[PDB]
Amino acid sequence: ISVEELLKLAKAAYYSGTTVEEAYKLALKLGISVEELLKLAEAAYYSGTTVEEAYKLALKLGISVEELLKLAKAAYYSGTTVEEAYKLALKLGISVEELLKLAKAAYYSGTTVEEAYKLALKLGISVEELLKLAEAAYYSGTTVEEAYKLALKLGISVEELLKLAKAAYYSGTTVEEAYKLALKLGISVEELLKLAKAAYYSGTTVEEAYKLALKLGISVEELLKLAEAAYYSGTTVEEAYKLALKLGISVEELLKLAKAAYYSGTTVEEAYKLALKLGISVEELLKLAKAAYYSGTTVEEAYKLALKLGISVEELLKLAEAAYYSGTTVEEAYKLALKLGISVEELLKLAKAAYYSGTTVEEAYKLALKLG
C-alpha cells in the first residue's frame, strides 16, 4: 500500500488495539477501503465496540460508515447506545448530522436530546441555531431560552449572541454588559470579541486595550496580534509596538518573530538580528525555530543543518518532526529517507505510522511494501 494508506491503517490499528496487517486484512474481509476502516475504527472507539461489530451495526441500520461515525459520536454525547440514538433520530424525523448537533446541544445544556429538540421547536429555531444558543448559554452560565430571550431583547442574532458570550467570558462580564460595552465603544460584536481577547492577553480591561489602540492608531485586529506578541515576549503591548517600529517591521512579522523568540529562548530583536545574519525571512526563521525545538538544537545550528543536507527550511522542519517521532537525529532520519528512496514528506508520514504502531520507520516501510 501507499505511505498515506499505511498511516491511516496505523491510526485505525491504534484505535482498535490491533496490528496494521490485522487492520488491513480486516478491511479486505469486510470489502471496504482504508479510509472507511479508519472511520469504522473511530466509530468503534466511540461506541465501545470492535471494528467488525461496528461494521455489522452499520449494515443492520442500513447506513454508511460516515453516518455510523456521526451516530457513534451522538450516542457518546448523549450517553446512549448507537441504536437508541438511531431510534430517537427516527422518532424526531431528523438526519444523523442533525442528531449529532442536537446531541452536542443537549450536552452543553445538561438536558436530553429530545428535550433540546422540544426546546428548538418551542423557540421556533433550527438545530444549528440551537447549538450556538447552547454554547452561548454554556459560556454565560444561563439557559438556552434565557440566552434566546436575551438575543431578542438586544435585537441581535444567534451568531452575534455567541460571539458576545465568548467576549463576556474573556472579559469576565455578563453578556448584556458586553453588549453595552460594544455600543459604548461604537464597535461591532466581532470587534469586541477580538478586543476582549487582546485585553485578556495583555492583562488589561477592554477599555484600556481600546484606548491603547486609539493612542497607537491601529486596528483591533492589529492590537490582538500585538497583544499575542507581547504575551509571547513577556513585554507590554506598547513596548512590542515600539519594537516593531524600531525594527521597521509589520505587526504580523513581529508576532512571528515573537513566536520564534519564544521557541528559541531569545529576545525578539536577536531573532530579527539572527534572520538578518542568516539572510532569511521572518517566516523562514519561525520554521527554523520550530525545527530547532524539535531537534533540541539552536536556530543557527538548525540552519547549518539545512545547508549541510542541501534542503529547504520547510524540508528541515518536516525532517525534524520525523526524527522526533522516531527518536533519531535529523541526519539519521535523512539517511533512512535516502536509503528508502522516499521524500521528506513521505518519511514524516512513515514516522507517524511507526509511532502509532510502535515500530521502526524502516519496519513500517517494509510492511507497506508487503501489503502491496
Side-chain angles (χ1 to χ4, degrees), residues 107-117 119-121 123-167:
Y107 176 77
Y108 277 97
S109 289
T111 65
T112 65
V113 172
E114 187 170 2
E115 280 171 341
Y117 183 78
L119 180 58
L121 278 182
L123 308 182
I125 62 173
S126 68
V127 180
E128 176 60 58
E129 279 176 322
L130 178 83
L131 178 54
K132 290 179 157 81
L133 271 186
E135 298 182 298
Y138 173 80
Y139 273 97
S140 77
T142 67
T143 73
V144 178
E145 197 162 1
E146 283 170 353
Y148 182 73
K149 249 72 173 301
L150 185 49
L152 225 65
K153 177 205 174 186
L154 300 181
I156 65 178
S157 66
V158 180
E159 171 67 73
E160 272 171 332
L161 183 73
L162 175 57
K163 283 179 180 175
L164 207 51
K166 293 176 182 175

